[PDB]
Amino acid sequence: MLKRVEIFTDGSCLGNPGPGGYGAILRYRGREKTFSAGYERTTNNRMELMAAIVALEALKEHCEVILSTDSHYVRKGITEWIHNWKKRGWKKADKKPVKNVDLWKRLDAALGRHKIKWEWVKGHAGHPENERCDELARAAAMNPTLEDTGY
């Protein structure tokens, strides 16, 4: 049996664009590791991606990951858009790079390192870990310390 890990994420900004943060919880054998950081200026969607990136990258080895997140953007990106972005060389109609290509590629790179099983959440209600990520993200966004160089 391969290591089984649970990851919960959430990201948000105060206004959009605006100060933002991400919150993620990694659970393995009952133990829960928390991750959070705030940026001076970014977007809601970039933070949603960042939360998943940071948590996944913390895995030092290949695992079976159960990712739980509430994000229409990430869901649409992973389940539909991404297949077309790759087919089109990550370039949009104006012949410029797809938005957030930097984070999308970083996330794809992280995803490919494990066996992922996405669980799309519709409202944090009934999902305590995700609510915790939401508060973790908001707390970081209110006390930023990083710059989103990619933004």
Curated annotation (Swiss-Prot):
Substitution effect: residue 48 to Q: Loss of activity
Any one biological process term the GO annotation gives: DNA replication, removal of RNA primer
Q: What happens when the gene is disrupted?
A: In a strain that encodes a retron, the msDNA is abnormally sized.
Q: Where is the RNase H type-1 domain?
A: 1-142
The record's remark on the cofactor is: Binds 1 Mg(2+) ion per subunit in the absence of substrate. Requires millimolar levels of Mg(2+) for maximal activity. Has low activity at micromolar concentrations of Mn(2+) and is inhibited at higher Mn(2+) levels. Can bind a second metal ion at a regulatory site, or after substrate binding.
Q: What is the effect of changing residue 70 to N?
A: Loss of activity
Superkingdom of origin organism = Bacteria
Q: Tell me where it resides.
A: Cytoplasm
Keywords (alphabetical) are: Cytoplasm, Endonuclease, Hydrolase, Magnesium, Metal-binding, Nuclease
The GO molecular function terms of this record are: endonuclease activity; magnesium ion binding; nucleic acid binding; RNA-DNA hybrid ribonuclease activity
Binding of Mg(2+) 2 occurs at 10, 134
Entry GO CC = cytoplasm
The EC number of this protein is 3.1.26.4
Which Gene3D superfamilies does this UniProt record tie to the protein? Ribonuclease H-like superfamily/Ribonuclease H (3.30.420.10)
- Name the Pfam families for this protein: RNase_H
Q: Which family does it belong to?
A: Belongs to the RNase H family.
By its UniProt entry, which PANTHER family does this protein fall under?
Answer: RIBONUCLEASE H1
Assembly and partners?
Monomer.
> According to its UniProt entry, what is the function of this protein?
Endonuclease that specifically degrades the RNA of RNA-DNA hybrids. RNase H participates in DNA replication; it helps to specify the origin of genomic replication by suppressing initiation at origins other than the oriC locus; along with the 5'-3' exonuclease of pol1, it removes RNA primers from the Okazaki fragments of lagging strand synthesis; and it defines the origin of replication for ColE1-type plasmids by specific cleavage of an RNA preprimer. Involved in production of retron derived msDNA (a branched RNA linked by a 2',5'-phosphodiester bond to a single-stranded DNA).
Give the HAMAP family listed for this entry: RNase_H (MF_00042)
Name of the featured protein: Ribonuclease HI
Q: What is the lineage of its organism?
A: Bacteria, Pseudomonadati, Pseudomonadota, Gammaproteobacteria, Enterobacterales
